[PDB]
Write a protein that binds this ligand. Structure first.
Ligand SMILES: [Zn+2]
Ligand SMILES: [Zn+2]
Lengths: 363, 363
């Protein structure tokens, strides 16, 4: 396969379905990437992640650069070998979690100390053996004044250029991995446009829409996506970082998004929330104590093929590890099934109808 | 298959190897039973438990009678259906954990309130759908004076008779399940003899050697087994309750034991202890941070086929669920491999040599 090749097979309105071919495998789009925190998709073996239908996973960098360490993972053979996932892996820049999980943070034009700079971020992702490298930037806080949103976006664009050059200066990385730039600008159209133009000028393999997983509310997110996605190069993948609620995904795809990631499936799974076509349920609720039906009546996952809600209800309330394992497998499978239905409906030119039907039942 | 049929295929000294045929499957002896607390072998799907080589698992009763409840599990279709394990299951009487996990316990000749009686215990195991039912007794504390050991043993024998009658009064249970009596008597030979005679007089499908997983030290346990096991009927299975350290198992088999169970493999696994032929290791130790070798160099389990000690070291130190899953699968597989080596060496008449070789390396 080539280093990177995104091809669009079918369209409907702003929605697209196709594939991204990379050295370690093919990624079907629109795609959902399970999140792997600390070199593991919580409670799941990689074979199980693959079994659910995942083509690629997201590897959090912040955690790995600290524990066990980027240089160490490299010495050990890379993240793929380390965790046992031989397919594509997209890594975040690690800058986000720095401004959320660390302390005494000191930001400057050079980078952030807590010294993670654009150059070091790219190098860390290189050491991890990332297939899709994310440019290092700043996820603008919400809400943000136009002045502050502009300053952060402008800085991120300067960092986008530095990320590009750092990535290109490393032969092995430039020839085997891909680089995505990130659009910033908060909820302001003029800033989003300036960011999109700056990114396109630099040139990237893919474009992410950053700064929209900040609790602005679905309506606002959709409004921003309405004018933001069209600004990005049409022939390259569009990645909406950190977005994952089922209805959010459907609406984003309707607006031109090709890639997604979020901890909702995994984290909520361990907390007792199971996704179903009739909306999410909290398996811990007493009404499931003697419910022999599977988590979801139509789901084709192994969990719904073998265990009842009653059993999983028992497991979660007892704090049993198998509870987390089963809820997580089902939720990730549910997400992958959602992406499959989305891809097929688009290919068949009935995605708009699918979106309508999905919402009517889910709500 | 028949309700119950134990056949001895080969012998060497006091050691025996054979099979126990039951309606839900065949059990190869000597056998190790993984412990399922709260209707689950912690951190493992039943298919994984089976994959390691387990023919039967032990279902703790105390927990299930409280949560989710015996009548409820029955209503839901039984423990097998509930947890997804369709092979034999041996259930403890639940009386042990009562004197360890509850409070304001009140013991009498009728039973124990915290009202679990011999009759209720048998009924609970029936509701759970147990294949091998354990008589309800009292696990004599260690150390114990001869007077106290005798009183407890005598009471347990009266309860053994009550357990037998309760089991026999229920047609469905008497025709599809088996009943094991438990030898008590602390470390006193005369009491062990009296208990063995009382049990044999009543008649059971199997005989357990109870009261020896109380921290008396291996030497003392072996000394007691030396004269205790020969007292039990030779043509029925001999079950050493709660014993599981690898070297303990080998020594017990050398003394006539056919069945074992213990939480060591699972519990220690989650705590970071991994069993290897060269002795146990604590994967959390810094010396494994960059060790690319599998948990054990010879182990044929899936974990040793795919992941390094370095990765598992990372997982456990990070408190990741996959860490518990991997350590547990390996440890249970290691135990099953130990039982396989024991069975084969006995069948080949070289068990004594195997025992010697095992100890030399393990220590
Ligand atoms: Zn499912
Ligand atoms: Zn192993």
């Amino acid at each position: 396969r080539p280093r990177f090749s995104f091809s669009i097979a079918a369209r409907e309105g702003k929605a697209r379905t196709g594939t991204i071919e990379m050295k370690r495998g093919v990624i079907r789009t629109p795609a959902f990437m399970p999140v792997g925190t600390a070199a593991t998709v919580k409670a799941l073996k990689p074979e199980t992640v693959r079994a659910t239908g995942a083509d690629i996973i997201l590897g959090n960098t912040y955690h790995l650069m600290l524990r066990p360490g980027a240089e160490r993972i490299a010495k050990l053979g890379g993240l793929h070998s380390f965790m046992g996932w031989d397919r594509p892996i997209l890594t975040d820049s690690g800058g986000y979690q720095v401004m959320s999980l660390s302390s005494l943070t000191k930001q400057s034009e050079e980078g952030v100390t807590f010294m993670l700079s654009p150059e070091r971020s790219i190098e860390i992702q290189h050491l991890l053996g990332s297939d899709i490298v994310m440019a290092f930037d700043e996820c603008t806080p919400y809400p943000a004044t136009p002045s502050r949103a502009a300053s952060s976006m402008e800085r991120s664009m300067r960092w986008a250029k530095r990320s590009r050059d750092a990535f290109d200066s490393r032969k092995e990385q430039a020839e085997n991995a891909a680089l995505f730039g990130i659009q910033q600008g908060s909820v302001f159209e003029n800033l989003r446009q300036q960011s999109a133009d700056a990114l396109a000028e630099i040139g990237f393999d893919g474009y992410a829409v950053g700064g929209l997983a900040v609790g602005e509310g679905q309506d606002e997110m959709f409004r921003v996506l309405d004018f933001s996605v069209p600004m990005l190069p049409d022939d390259k993948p569009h990645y909406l970082m950190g977005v994952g609620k089922p209805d959010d995904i459907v609406g984003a795809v309707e607006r031109g998004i090709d890639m997604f990631d979020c901890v909702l499936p995994t984290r909520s799974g361990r907390n007792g929330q199971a996704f179903t076509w009739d909306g999410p349920i909290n398996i811990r609720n007493a009404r499931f104590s003697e419910d022999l039906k599977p988590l979801d009546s139509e789901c084709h996952c192994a969990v719904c093929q073998k265990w009842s809600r009653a059993y999983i209800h028992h497991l979660i309330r007892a704090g049993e590890i198998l509870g987390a394992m089963l809820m997580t497998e089902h939720n990730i499978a549910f997400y992958q099934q959602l992406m499959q239905k989305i891809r097929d409906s688009i290919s068949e030119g009935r995605f708009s109808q699918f979106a309508q039907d999905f919402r009517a039942r889910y709500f």
